[PDB]
Coordinates of C-alpha atoms and ligand atoms in Angstrom, one line a residue:
Chain A
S1116 CA 42.8 -9.0 8.9
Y1117 CA 41.2 -6.9 10.7
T1118 CA 39.7 -8.3 14.6
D1119 CA 38.3 -4.7 15.8
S1120 CA 34.5 -4.6 16.7
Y1121 CA 34.4 -2.1 13.4
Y1122 CA 36.5 -3.6 11.0
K1123 CA 35.9 -7.4 11.7
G1124 CA 36.8 -10.0 8.9
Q1125 CA 38.6 -7.3 6.4
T1126 CA 41.1 -9.0 4.3
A1127 CA 43.4 -8.3 2.0
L1128 CA 40.9 -9.5 -1.1
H1129 CA 38.4 -6.5 0.0
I1130 CA 40.8 -4.1 0.3
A1131 CA 41.8 -5.2 -3.4
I1132 CA 38.2 -5.3 -4.7
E1133 CA 37.7 -2.2 -3.8
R1134 CA 40.7 -0.6 -5.1
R1135 CA 39.7 -2.2 -8.1
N1136 CA 42.7 -3.9 -8.4
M1137 CA 42.6 -6.5 -10.4
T1138 CA 45.7 -7.5 -10.8
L1139 CA 46.3 -8.4 -6.7
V1140 CA 43.0 -10.0 -6.7
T1141 CA 43.9 -12.5 -9.5
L1142 CA 47.7 -12.9 -7.4
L1143 CA 45.6 -13.1 -3.6
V1144 CA 43.2 -16.0 -5.2
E1145 CA 46.3 -17.4 -6.8
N1146 CA 47.9 -17.6 -3.6
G1147 CA 45.7 -19.0 -1.7
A1148 CA 43.0 -16.5 0.0
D1149 CA 39.9 -17.4 0.8
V1150 CA 36.9 -15.9 -1.5
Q1151 CA 34.5 -17.0 1.2
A1152 CA 35.3 -15.1 4.0
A1153 CA 32.8 -12.8 6.3
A1154 CA 33.3 -9.3 6.8
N1155 CA 31.1 -8.5 9.4
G1156 CA 32.4 -5.6 11.2
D1157 CA 30.2 -2.7 12.2
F1158 CA 31.3 -0.6 9.4
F1159 CA 30.3 -3.5 7.1
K1160 CA 26.5 -4.5 8.4
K1161 CA 23.2 -2.6 7.9
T1162 CA 22.9 -0.2 10.6
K1163 CA 20.8 2.9 11.3
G1164 CA 22.8 5.0 14.3
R1165 CA 26.0 4.7 12.2
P1166 CA 27.6 5.3 8.5
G1167 CA 28.8 2.6 7.3
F1168 CA 28.7 0.2 3.4
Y1169 CA 26.9 -2.3 3.8
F1170 CA 27.6 -4.9 0.5
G1171 CA 26.9 -8.3 1.8
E1172 CA 30.0 -8.9 3.4
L1173 CA 31.4 -11.4 0.9
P1174 CA 34.4 -10.9 -1.5
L1175 CA 31.4 -11.8 -4.8
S1176 CA 28.9 -9.4 -3.5
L1177 CA 31.9 -6.3 -2.7
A1178 CA 33.0 -6.8 -6.6
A1179 CA 29.0 -6.7 -7.4
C1180 CA 28.1 -3.9 -5.8
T1181 CA 31.5 -2.0 -7.1
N1182 CA 30.5 -2.7 -10.9
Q1183 CA 33.1 -5.0 -12.0
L1184 CA 32.0 -7.6 -13.7
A1185 CA 35.4 -8.9 -14.3
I1186 CA 36.4 -10.1 -11.1
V1187 CA 33.0 -11.6 -10.9
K1188 CA 33.7 -13.7 -13.3
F1189 CA 37.1 -14.4 -12.4
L1190 CA 36.1 -15.3 -8.8
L1191 CA 33.2 -17.8 -10.3
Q1192 CA 35.1 -19.5 -12.6
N1193 CA 39.2 -19.2 -11.7
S1194 CA 39.7 -23.1 -10.4
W1195 CA 42.3 -22.0 -7.9
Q1196 CA 39.4 -21.2 -5.7
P1197 CA 35.7 -20.6 -7.3
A1198 CA 33.6 -18.8 -5.1
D1199 CA 30.2 -19.9 -4.0
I1200 CA 27.0 -17.9 -5.8
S1201 CA 24.4 -19.0 -3.7
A1202 CA 26.4 -17.9 -0.3
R1203 CA 24.6 -16.2 2.4
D1204 CA 25.8 -13.5 4.7
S1205 CA 24.9 -13.4 8.3
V1206 CA 21.5 -12.0 7.0
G1207 CA 21.0 -14.5 4.7
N1208 CA 21.2 -12.2 1.7
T1209 CA 23.2 -13.3 -1.0
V1210 CA 24.4 -11.3 -4.1
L1211 CA 21.4 -10.9 -5.7
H1212 CA 19.8 -9.8 -2.0
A1213 CA 23.2 -7.1 -1.8
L1214 CA 22.8 -5.7 -4.7
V1215 CA 18.9 -5.3 -4.4
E1216 CA 20.0 -3.6 -1.0
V1217 CA 22.5 -0.8 -2.5
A1218 CA 19.7 0.5 -5.5
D1219 CA 18.2 4.3 -4.6
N1220 CA 16.2 4.6 -8.0
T1221 CA 18.8 6.5 -10.0
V1222 CA 19.6 6.8 -13.2
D1223 CA 23.2 5.2 -13.1
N1224 CA 22.3 3.1 -10.3
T1225 CA 19.3 1.4 -12.3
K1226 CA 21.4 1.0 -14.8
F1227 CA 24.4 -0.8 -13.5
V1228 CA 22.6 -3.1 -11.0
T1229 CA 20.6 -4.0 -13.6
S1230 CA 23.1 -5.0 -15.7
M1231 CA 25.5 -6.6 -12.8
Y1232 CA 22.2 -8.7 -11.4
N1233 CA 21.5 -9.6 -15.2
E1234 CA 24.6 -10.8 -15.6
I1235 CA 25.5 -12.5 -12.4
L1236 CA 21.8 -14.4 -12.9
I1237 CA 23.5 -15.5 -16.7
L1238 CA 26.3 -17.0 -14.7
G1239 CA 24.4 -18.5 -12.3
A1240 CA 22.7 -20.1 -15.3
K1241 CA 25.6 -21.3 -17.0
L1242 CA 27.7 -22.4 -14.4
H1243 CA 24.4 -23.9 -12.2
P1244 CA 21.4 -24.4 -14.7
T1245 CA 19.9 -26.3 -11.7
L1246 CA 20.5 -23.2 -9.0
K1247 CA 17.7 -20.8 -8.6
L1248 CA 18.9 -17.9 -6.9
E1249 CA 15.9 -16.0 -7.6
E1250 CA 14.1 -18.8 -4.8
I1251 CA 16.4 -18.0 -1.9
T1252 CA 15.0 -16.5 1.2
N1253 CA 17.4 -13.9 3.0
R1254 CA 16.6 -13.9 7.5
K1255 CA 13.7 -12.0 6.8
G1256 CA 12.4 -14.5 4.2
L1257 CA 12.0 -11.8 1.4
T1258 CA 13.9 -13.1 -1.5
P1259 CA 15.5 -10.2 -4.1
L1260 CA 12.3 -9.6 -5.5
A1261 CA 10.2 -9.0 -2.2
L1262 CA 13.2 -6.8 -0.7
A1263 CA 12.9 -4.5 -3.3
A1264 CA 8.8 -4.4 -3.1
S1265 CA 9.4 -3.9 0.4
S1266 CA 12.0 -1.1 0.1
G1267 CA 10.5 0.4 -2.5
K1268 CA 13.2 0.3 -5.2
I1269 CA 11.0 1.4 -8.5
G1270 CA 14.1 0.4 -10.6
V1271 CA 14.7 -3.3 -9.9
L1272 CA 11.2 -3.8 -9.6
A1273 CA 10.7 -2.2 -13.4
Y1274 CA 13.3 -4.6 -14.3
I1275 CA 12.5 -7.9 -12.9
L1276 CA 8.7 -8.0 -13.4
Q1277 CA 8.8 -7.2 -17.0
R1278 CA 12.2 -8.5 -17.5
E1279 CA 12.3 -11.0 -21.4
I1280 CA 16.0 -11.9 -21.8
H1281 CA 16.7 -13.0 -25.9
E1282 CA 19.2 -15.1 -25.9
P1283 CA 18.7 -19.1 -26.6
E1284 CA 20.1 -21.5 -23.5
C1285 CA 19.0 -19.3 -20.8
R1286 CA 14.9 -17.7 -21.9
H1287 CA 13.8 -20.4 -18.9
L1288 CA 15.0 -16.7 -17.2
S1289 CA 12.3 -15.1 -18.5
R1290 CA 9.5 -13.4 -16.7
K1291 CA 7.9 -11.4 -19.7
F1292 CA 7.2 -13.0 -23.0
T1293 CA 5.9 -11.1 -26.4
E1294 CA 3.2 -13.3 -28.0
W1295 CA 2.8 -11.2 -31.2
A1296 CA 3.1 -7.4 -32.1
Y1297 CA 1.5 -5.1 -34.5
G1298 CA 1.6 -1.5 -36.0
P1299 CA 0.9 0.2 -32.1
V1300 CA -0.1 -2.8 -30.6
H1301 CA 1.4 -6.1 -29.0
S1302 CA 0.4 -8.9 -26.7
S1303 CA 2.9 -10.4 -24.4
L1304 CA 2.6 -12.9 -21.4
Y1305 CA 4.1 -12.1 -17.5
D1306 CA 4.6 -15.0 -14.9
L1307 CA 3.1 -14.0 -12.7
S1308 CA 4.8 -16.3 -9.9
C1309 CA 5.1 -14.8 -6.6
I1310 CA 2.6 -12.0 -7.1
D1311 CA -0.4 -13.4 -6.3
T1312 CA 0.0 -16.6 -4.7
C1313 CA 3.5 -17.1 -3.1
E1314 CA 2.7 -19.0 0.1
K1315 CA 4.9 -17.5 2.0
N1316 CA 5.0 -13.4 1.1
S1317 CA 3.9 -12.1 -2.4
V1318 CA 4.4 -9.0 -4.0
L1319 CA 1.0 -7.3 -3.3
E1320 CA 0.9 -7.8 0.0
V1321 CA 4.5 -6.4 0.8
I1322 CA 3.2 -3.3 -1.2
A1323 CA -0.2 -3.0 0.2
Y1324 CA 0.9 -3.8 3.5
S1325 CA 4.1 -1.1 3.6
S1326 CA 4.3 0.7 7.0
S1327 CA 3.7 4.1 5.0
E1328 CA 7.6 4.9 4.5
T1329 CA 8.4 3.7 1.7
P1330 CA 9.1 6.4 -0.8
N1331 CA 7.1 5.2 -4.1
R1332 CA 4.3 3.1 -2.2
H1333 CA 2.1 4.2 -4.4
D1334 CA 4.1 4.4 -7.9
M1335 CA 5.2 0.4 -7.5
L1336 CA 1.6 -0.1 -8.3
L1337 CA 1.4 1.6 -11.2
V1338 CA 3.6 -0.8 -12.9
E1339 CA 2.1 -2.6 -15.9
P1340 CA 1.3 -6.0 -14.6
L1341 CA 0.5 -5.4 -11.1
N1342 CA -2.1 -2.4 -12.7
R1343 CA -3.8 -5.0 -15.2
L1344 CA -4.0 -7.4 -12.2
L1345 CA -5.9 -5.6 -9.7
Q1346 CA -8.0 -3.8 -12.4
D1347 CA -9.0 -7.3 -13.4
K1348 CA -9.6 -9.2 -10.3
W1349 CA -11.2 -5.6 -9.4
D1350 CA -13.9 -5.2 -12.3
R1351 CA -13.9 -10.1 -12.4
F1352 CA -15.5 -10.4 -8.8
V1353 CA -14.1 -7.9 -5.9
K1354 CA -16.1 -5.0 -7.4
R1355 CA -20.0 -7.1 -6.5
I1356 CA -17.9 -8.1 -3.4
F1357 CA -17.9 -4.8 -2.3
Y1358 CA -21.1 -3.5 -3.0
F1359 CA -22.7 -6.1 -1.6
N1360 CA -21.1 -5.9 1.4
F1361 CA -21.7 -2.0 1.7
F1362 CA -25.0 -2.6 1.0
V1363 CA -25.3 -5.3 4.2
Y1364 CA -23.9 -2.4 5.9
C1365 CA -26.5 0.1 5.4
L1366 CA -28.6 -2.3 6.5
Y1367 CA -27.0 -2.9 9.8
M1368 CA -26.6 1.0 10.7
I1369 CA -30.7 0.9 9.4
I1370 CA -31.2 -1.6 11.7
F1371 CA -29.6 -0.3 14.4
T1372 CA -30.7 3.0 14.1
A1373 CA -34.5 2.0 14.1
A1374 CA -33.7 -0.1 17.2
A1375 CA -31.9 2.7 19.6
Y1376 CA -34.6 5.4 18.3
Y1377 CA -37.8 3.0 19.2
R1378 CA -35.3 2.0 23.2
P1379 CA -38.2 2.1 26.4
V1380 CA -37.8 5.3 28.8
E1381 CA -38.5 3.4 32.9
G1382 CA -36.0 2.8 35.1
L1383 CA -33.1 -0.1 35.6
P1384 CA -32.5 -2.2 32.9
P1385 CA -32.9 -4.5 31.2
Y1386 CA -36.8 -4.6 30.5
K1387 CA -39.0 -6.8 30.4
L1388 CA -40.1 -7.7 26.9
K1389 CA -44.5 -7.7 26.2
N1390 CA -46.4 -9.8 24.2
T1391 CA -46.8 -7.3 21.7
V1392 CA -45.1 -7.0 17.7
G1393 CA -43.0 -3.6 18.6
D1394 CA -41.2 -5.4 21.4
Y1395 CA -40.3 -8.2 19.2
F1396 CA -38.6 -5.8 16.2
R1397 CA -36.9 -4.1 19.0
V1398 CA -35.4 -7.3 20.5
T1399 CA -34.3 -8.5 17.1
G1400 CA -32.3 -5.3 16.3
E1401 CA -30.7 -5.3 19.4
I1402 CA -29.9 -8.8 18.7
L1403 CA -29.0 -7.9 15.0
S1404 CA -27.1 -4.8 17.0
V1405 CA -24.9 -6.4 19.2
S1406 CA -24.0 -9.4 16.6
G1407 CA -22.6 -6.7 14.2
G1408 CA -20.4 -5.3 17.6
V1409 CA -19.1 -8.2 18.4
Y1410 CA -18.2 -9.1 15.0
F1411 CA -16.5 -6.1 14.1
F1412 CA -14.8 -6.9 17.1
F1413 CA -13.2 -10.1 16.6
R1414 CA -12.5 -8.7 13.1
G1415 CA -10.3 -6.0 14.8
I1416 CA -8.2 -8.6 16.6
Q1417 CA -7.6 -10.4 14.0
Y1418 CA -6.1 -7.4 11.8
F1419 CA -3.8 -5.8 15.4
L1420 CA -2.6 -9.6 15.3
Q1421 CA -2.0 -10.2 12.1
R1422 CA -0.3 -7.1 11.2
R1423 CA 1.7 -6.5 14.7
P1424 CA 1.9 -2.4 13.8
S1425 CA 4.0 -0.8 16.3
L1426 CA 2.2 2.3 18.4
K1427 CA 5.1 5.0 16.4
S1428 CA 3.0 3.9 12.9
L1429 CA -0.4 2.8 14.9
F1430 CA -2.6 5.9 13.6
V1431 CA -0.4 7.1 10.6
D1432 CA -1.7 3.4 9.2
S1433 CA -4.6 1.5 10.2
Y1434 CA -7.0 4.4 10.9
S1435 CA -10.0 3.0 9.5
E1436 CA -9.2 -0.2 11.5
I1437 CA -9.2 1.0 14.5
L1438 CA -12.3 3.5 14.3
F1439 CA -14.4 0.1 13.8
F1440 CA -12.4 -1.8 16.6
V1441 CA -13.6 1.4 19.0
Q1442 CA -16.8 1.4 17.6
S1443 CA -17.7 -1.9 18.6
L1444 CA -15.8 -1.8 21.9
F1445 CA -18.8 0.9 22.6
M1446 CA -21.3 -1.2 21.4
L1447 CA -20.0 -3.7 23.9
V1448 CA -19.6 -1.3 26.5
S1449 CA -23.7 -0.4 26.5
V1450 CA -24.2 -4.2 26.8
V1451 CA -22.4 -4.7 29.7
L1452 CA -24.1 -1.7 31.3
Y1453 CA -27.4 -2.3 29.6
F1454 CA -27.0 -6.2 31.6
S1455 CA -25.5 -4.6 34.8
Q1456 CA -28.6 -2.8 35.5
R1457 CA -27.3 1.1 34.6
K1458 CA -29.0 3.9 32.3
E1459 CA -26.2 5.0 31.8
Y1460 CA -25.7 2.0 28.8
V1461 CA -27.7 4.8 26.5
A1462 CA -24.3 6.8 26.5
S1463 CA -21.5 4.3 25.2
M1464 CA -25.0 3.2 22.6
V1465 CA -24.9 6.9 21.5
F1466 CA -21.5 6.9 21.2
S1467 CA -21.7 3.8 18.7
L1468 CA -24.5 4.8 16.9
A1469 CA -22.2 8.3 15.8
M1470 CA -19.6 6.8 15.1
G1471 CA -21.4 4.0 13.4
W1472 CA -23.0 6.6 10.7
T1473 CA -19.0 8.4 9.9
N1474 CA -17.9 5.0 9.6
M1475 CA -19.8 5.2 7.0
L1476 CA -17.2 7.0 4.6
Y1477 CA -14.5 4.0 4.8
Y1478 CA -16.9 3.1 1.8
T1479 CA -16.4 5.8 -0.3
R1480 CA -12.4 4.5 -0.1
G1481 CA -11.7 2.8 -3.8
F1482 CA -14.5 5.4 -5.7
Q1483 CA -12.2 8.1 -7.8
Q1484 CA -14.3 10.6 -7.1
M1485 CA -14.9 9.9 -3.2
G1486 CA -11.9 8.7 -1.9
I1487 CA -10.3 12.1 -1.4
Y1488 CA -12.5 13.2 1.1
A1489 CA -12.2 10.3 3.2
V1490 CA -7.7 10.4 2.9
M1491 CA -8.3 14.4 3.7
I1492 CA -10.2 14.0 7.3
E1493 CA -7.7 11.2 8.0
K1494 CA -4.9 13.1 7.3
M1495 CA -5.9 16.7 9.1
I1496 CA -7.3 15.0 12.1
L1497 CA -3.7 12.6 12.2
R1498 CA -1.3 15.5 11.5
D1499 CA -2.5 19.6 12.1
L1500 CA -5.7 19.3 14.7
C1501 CA -2.9 17.0 16.4
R1502 CA -0.5 19.6 16.6
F1503 CA -1.9 22.8 17.3
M1504 CA -4.1 21.0 20.5
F1505 CA -1.0 22.0 21.9
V1506 CA -0.8 26.0 21.5
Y1507 CA -4.2 26.0 21.6
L1508 CA -4.9 24.0 25.0
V1509 CA -1.9 26.6 26.3
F1510 CA -4.0 29.8 25.2
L1511 CA -7.0 28.3 26.8
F1512 CA -5.5 27.3 29.9
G1513 CA -3.4 30.7 30.1
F1514 CA -6.7 33.0 29.7
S1515 CA -9.1 30.6 31.7
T1516 CA -6.9 30.6 34.9
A1517 CA -6.4 34.2 34.8
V1518 CA -9.6 35.6 34.3
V1519 CA -11.2 32.9 37.0
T1520 CA -8.4 34.6 39.2
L1521 CA -10.1 38.0 38.6
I1522 CA -13.6 37.4 39.1
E1523 CA -14.7 37.4 42.5
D1524 CA -18.2 35.4 42.4
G1525 CA -20.1 36.1 39.0
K1526 CA -20.7 34.1 36.5
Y1527 CA -16.8 33.5 35.0
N1528 CA -16.2 32.6 38.3
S1529 CA -15.8 28.4 37.5
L1530 CA -12.9 26.9 35.8
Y1531 CA -15.9 24.8 33.4
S1532 CA -17.9 28.1 32.6
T1533 CA -15.3 30.7 31.8
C1534 CA -13.0 27.1 29.5
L1535 CA -16.8 26.9 27.8
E1536 CA -17.5 30.2 27.3
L1537 CA -13.7 30.9 25.9
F1538 CA -14.2 28.3 23.6
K1539 CA -16.9 29.7 22.6
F1540 CA -15.2 32.7 21.9
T1541 CA -12.7 31.2 19.3
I1542 CA -15.7 29.7 17.0
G1543 CA -17.3 33.1 17.2
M1544 CA -20.6 32.1 19.5
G1545 CA -19.2 34.8 22.5
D1546 CA -21.9 37.0 24.4
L1547 CA -19.3 39.8 24.9
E1548 CA -22.4 41.8 28.3
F1549 CA -20.5 44.0 30.1
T1550 CA -23.7 45.4 32.2
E1551 CA -22.0 43.6 35.5
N1552 CA -20.8 45.7 39.0
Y1553 CA -17.3 44.1 39.3
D1554 CA -14.2 45.6 39.6
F1555 CA -11.2 45.4 37.7
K1556 CA -13.4 46.1 34.6
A1557 CA -11.3 47.3 32.4
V1558 CA -8.8 44.8 33.3
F1559 CA -11.1 41.8 32.3
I1560 CA -12.2 43.3 29.2
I1561 CA -8.9 43.9 28.3
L1562 CA -7.8 40.1 28.9
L1563 CA -11.2 39.3 26.5
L1564 CA -9.9 41.7 23.8
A1565 CA -6.7 40.1 23.8
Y1566 CA -8.0 36.5 24.0
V1567 CA -10.3 37.0 21.0
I1568 CA -7.4 39.0 19.0
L1569 CA -5.6 35.9 19.3
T1570 CA -7.3 33.2 19.4
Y1571 CA -10.2 33.6 16.7
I1572 CA -8.4 36.4 14.5
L1573 CA -4.8 35.0 14.6
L1574 CA -4.6 31.2 15.7
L1575 CA -7.7 30.1 13.9
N1576 CA -6.4 31.9 10.7
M1577 CA -3.2 29.7 11.1
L1578 CA -5.0 26.4 11.6
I1579 CA -7.3 26.9 8.4
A1580 CA -4.0 28.3 6.5
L1581 CA -2.2 24.7 7.3
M1582 CA -5.6 22.9 6.3
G1583 CA -5.7 24.4 2.8
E1584 CA -2.2 23.7 2.4
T1585 CA -2.7 19.8 3.7
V1586 CA -5.7 20.0 1.4
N1587 CA -5.0 21.2 -2.0
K1588 CA -1.7 19.3 -1.9
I1589 CA -3.7 16.2 -1.6
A1590 CA -6.4 16.6 -4.2
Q1591 CA -3.9 16.5 -7.8
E1592 CA -2.8 13.1 -5.5
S1593 CA -5.7 11.4 -5.9
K1594 CA -5.3 9.1 -9.2
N1595 CA -2.8 7.6 -6.6
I1596 CA -4.3 7.1 -3.7
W1597 CA -7.7 5.7 -5.6
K1598 CA -5.2 3.0 -7.2
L1599 CA -3.4 1.8 -3.2
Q1600 CA -6.8 2.2 -1.6
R1601 CA -8.0 -0.2 -4.1
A1602 CA -5.2 -2.6 -4.1
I1603 CA -5.5 -3.2 -0.3
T1604 CA -9.2 -3.5 -0.3
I1605 CA -8.9 -6.8 -3.5
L1606 CA -6.5 -8.1 -1.1
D1607 CA -8.6 -8.3 2.2
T1608 CA -11.4 -8.9 -0.1
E1609 CA -9.7 -12.0 -1.3
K1610 CA -7.6 -12.9 1.6
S1611 CA -10.9 -13.7 4.3
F1612 CA -13.9 -14.4 2.0
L1613 CA -15.2 -16.5 3.8
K1614 CA -15.8 -19.7 2.1
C1615 CA -12.8 -21.8 1.5
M1616 CA -12.7 -21.1 -1.8
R1617 CA -9.1 -19.1 -3.4
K1618 CA -9.7 -19.3 -7.5
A1619 CA -8.3 -16.9 -7.5
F1620 CA -6.0 -17.1 -10.5
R1621 CA -5.8 -15.2 -13.7
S1622 CA -5.0 -16.8 -17.2
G1623 CA -4.2 -20.5 -17.9
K1624 CA -1.9 -22.6 -16.6
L1625 CA -0.1 -22.4 -19.6
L1626 CA 3.6 -23.6 -21.1
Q1627 CA 5.9 -20.6 -22.2
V1628 CA 9.3 -22.2 -22.9
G1629 CA 9.1 -26.2 -22.7
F1630 CA 12.7 -26.6 -22.4
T1631 CA 14.2 -26.3 -19.1
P1632 CA 18.1 -27.4 -18.9
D1633 CA 16.6 -30.1 -17.7
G1634 CA 14.2 -32.4 -19.9
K1635 CA 11.0 -30.9 -18.1
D1636 CA 8.6 -28.5 -19.3
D1637 CA 7.2 -25.0 -17.0
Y1638 CA 3.5 -24.4 -16.6
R1639 CA 4.3 -21.0 -15.0
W1640 CA 0.3 -19.4 -15.0
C1641 CA 0.8 -16.9 -16.8
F1642 CA -1.2 -14.1 -17.8
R1643 CA -1.7 -12.3 -21.1
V1644 CA -1.6 -8.6 -21.2
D1645 CA -2.0 -6.2 -24.4
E1646 CA -0.6 -2.8 -25.0
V1647 CA -0.9 -0.3 -27.4
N1648 CA 2.0 2.6 -27.7
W1649 CA 2.5 5.3 -30.5
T1650 CA 5.5 5.3 -30.7
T1651 CA 7.5 6.2 -34.4
Chain B
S850 CA -7.4 -15.9 -44.6
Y851 CA -7.8 -15.2 -40.2
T852 CA -11.5 -16.6 -39.4
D853 CA -11.3 -15.6 -35.6
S854 CA -13.2 -13.2 -34.0
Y855 CA -10.5 -10.9 -33.9
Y856 CA -8.5 -10.1 -37.1
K857 CA -11.4 -11.7 -39.7
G858 CA -10.4 -10.5 -42.9
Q859 CA -6.9 -10.0 -42.6
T860 CA -4.6 -11.7 -45.2
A861 CA -0.5 -11.2 -46.4
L862 CA -1.3 -8.2 -48.1
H863 CA -2.1 -6.4 -44.8
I864 CA 0.7 -8.0 -43.1
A865 CA 3.2 -6.8 -45.8
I866 CA 2.0 -3.4 -45.6
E867 CA 2.8 -3.5 -41.6
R868 CA 5.9 -5.2 -42.0
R869 CA 7.0 -2.2 -44.6
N870 CA 7.7 -5.1 -47.0
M871 CA 7.7 -2.8 -50.2
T872 CA 8.8 -6.0 -52.5
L873 CA 6.2 -8.0 -51.0
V874 CA 3.4 -6.1 -51.6
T875 CA 4.8 -5.7 -55.2
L876 CA 4.6 -9.5 -55.4
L877 CA 1.9 -10.0 -53.5
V878 CA -0.1 -8.2 -56.1
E879 CA 1.3 -9.3 -59.5
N880 CA -0.4 -12.7 -57.8
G881 CA -3.3 -11.7 -58.0
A882 CA -3.8 -10.2 -54.6
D883 CA -7.2 -8.4 -53.5
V884 CA -7.0 -4.4 -52.8
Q885 CA -10.0 -3.8 -51.4
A886 CA -10.4 -6.7 -48.7
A887 CA -12.2 -5.7 -45.6
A888 CA -10.4 -6.6 -42.3
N889 CA -13.2 -6.1 -39.8
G890 CA -12.3 -8.3 -37.1
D891 CA -12.4 -6.7 -33.6
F892 CA -9.0 -6.1 -33.0
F893 CA -9.4 -3.6 -36.7
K894 CA -12.2 -1.8 -35.6
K895 CA -12.9 0.9 -33.4
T896 CA -13.9 0.7 -29.9
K897 CA -13.5 2.1 -26.3
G898 CA -12.9 -0.5 -23.5
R899 CA -10.3 -2.9 -25.6
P900 CA -7.2 -2.5 -27.5
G901 CA -6.7 -2.7 -31.2
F902 CA -5.7 -1.1 -33.9
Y903 CA -8.8 0.7 -36.2
Ligands
6EU2452 C1 -10.0 7.4 18.3 C2 -10.1 8.1 17.4 C3 -8.6 8.7 16.6 C4 -10.8 9.7 17.9 C5 -12.5 8.7 17.9 C6 -13.7 9.8 17.8 C7 -13.8 10.5 19.1 C8 -13.5 10.6 17.0 O1 -13.0 12.0 17.3 C9 -11.5 11.9 17.4 C10 -10.8 12.7 17.9 C11 -11.3 14.7 17.7 C12 -12.6 14.3 17.6 C13 -13.7 15.5 17.7 C14 -12.7 16.3 16.1 C15 -11.7 16.1 15.8 C16 -11.3 14.9 16.5 O2 -10.6 11.3 15.9 C17 -11.5 10.3 16.1 C18 -12.9 9.8 15.7 C19 -12.6 10.7 14.2 C20 -14.6 11.0 13.6 C21 -14.3 12.1 11.9 O3 -13.4 11.1 11.1 C22 -13.7 10.7 10.1 O4 -14.6 11.6 9.4 C23 -15.0 9.2 9.6 C24 -13.4 8.5 9.3 C25 -12.9 9.5 8.0 C26 -12.5 8.6 7.1 C27 -12.0 7.1 7.7 O5 -10.8 6.4 6.8 C28 -13.1 6.4 8.5 O6 -13.3 5.1 8.0 C29 -13.8 4.3 9.1 C30 -13.9 7.2 8.6 C31 -15.1 10.5 14.1 C32 -16.0 10.3 15.5 O7 -15.5 8.9 15.6 C33 -17.3 10.2 15.9 O8 -18.0 10.3 15.8 C34 -17.5 11.1 17.4 C35 -18.0 11.3 17.9 C36 -15.9 11.4 17.4 C37 -14.9 11.4 16.3 O9 -11.1 10.4 18.1
XPS2453 C1 -24.5 35.7 21.7 N1 -23.6 36.6 21.0 C2 -23.6 35.8 19.1 C3 -24.3 37.1 18.6 O1 -23.7 38.6 19.1 C4 -24.0 36.7 17.5 O2 -22.3 36.9 16.7 C5 -24.6 37.3 16.1 O3 -25.4 37.9 16.5 C6 -24.8 37.1 14.8 O4 -23.9 35.8 14.4 C7 -26.0 35.6 15.2 O5 -27.2 36.7 15.8

């Protein structure tokens, strides 16, 4: 075998299978070759910063990945050295994990990967009727279904979630079961296992809490069982809880607004209460406001600990949680200054109140019409203004320091005022009063004119064109982003729920087959769906 | 016939016609089937907020 750092573990059997030499494989297995050798070189492992071919490190997974069912049947069934269908590589991936890994959502890839997956499952059921390969988790704790959901393999999900086997002795592997079919309409049951309740890591969690790099994060929710589940959960109980939370937040903001508006104007907090109705309602509003701030604070910390987001995607995702957290931080700083005998608590309070209203736009998420505006604002603030800030600051600093250098003891002779006035020129709020008596007036006018042409005309309209691109690019994507917001909202509402009750099952605990490989009968909480199709 | 809320009034003639069984339809009409029966269950009525086959 190879003993280098790059081809570590490559042996003759891997070469034979890769070369599609059935004869040499048969001879090698007949001659006592090891069918469980691990090809664990850097070439053979999952990697980012180097080309490679990760297949699962084993001859069986190599045959499976390369679309050679004959070799798979040989390795599993041959008596000289049968292969272990449940073998796990260094990553913990089985052959099914390897097959899911090498998918890429193309037509031929979908076809042969689906076929090989199906045939491997049938062979496993015949050879090992008590073995459930799909329940095996890799080192990351992912089943093949969870792995496919995580990586955004649309074809593998579209196969697995609605899988139906029309063959006896293996129908217990099916996840879709058909109850009836009429002319255009037909009713079926879907298995639902490890979609809603998994105890480790469900499909809906994996889709919703993905890192936003998944190429088909939105389309995964269009697959029919998930779409029906989210619609059912929405209509059943989540919609009312969402509206109730929105209403309570509105009441909170109204109380905070009223409490802030009637603040006292004397010096040196804290301010003594008087035996009058106004002070009692005022301090009540203060207490409720600080209470809400503390609530949001702890919710934000719980979110960050549960998700553990990285910095690179800290703001790409988790935008709304960050803003709610920042609001609560401003409230707490206001409390600290209030009890520290400083008037400047007012400043902190004011900012929180401002955010307290604008974060109301979070509750537009999940409405098909109004949700788009929050997303447009988020993308524009994160993408376009963030990049354009440096270009504009270069122009601002250059022209400001030029002008400040030119003037000798005028109104412009200070960085503060000059920068403010140039910013006003950028938005069209200038003065242009050339009624002064300083020298080099022509140079000053040329500088101001060049700045105004460069910033008011050229740069600002470039910015506006880019924002127009971003706005019009996601206007038609609303139908999907709505669904994704709906999904994450539902999962959060079910997750917290603050009553310890988790009666979130969908349909009856029904029996499908009744004839396991053993004498048991499997009740799997299947969910009924009726679908319409006008074909032919 | 079915006596539920969804398939009310459906009889063998409707099933045979849906299945495209000319022979069974001819036999059923020959055996005294009612060709004017009303299958007015919720599955077979016009509706917006439910699938069906009107
Ligand atoms: C921490 C961040 C990211 C942030 C906090 C403050 C300072 C913020 O300005 C920014 C930077 C900024 C400032 C001024 C103009 C544009 C951008 O963006 C947000 C942040 C951005 C906004 C504007 O964003 C919104 O439209 C609200 C909003 C949109 C979408 C949402 O999903 C959402 O969920 C809570 C909220 C509101 C402010 O918090 C606000 O009220 C004040 C006073 C400034 C805005 O800094
Ligand atoms: C102070 N300089 C600003 C004005 O020139 C202003 O642009 C115009 O008057 C018009 O927008 C409103 O009067």
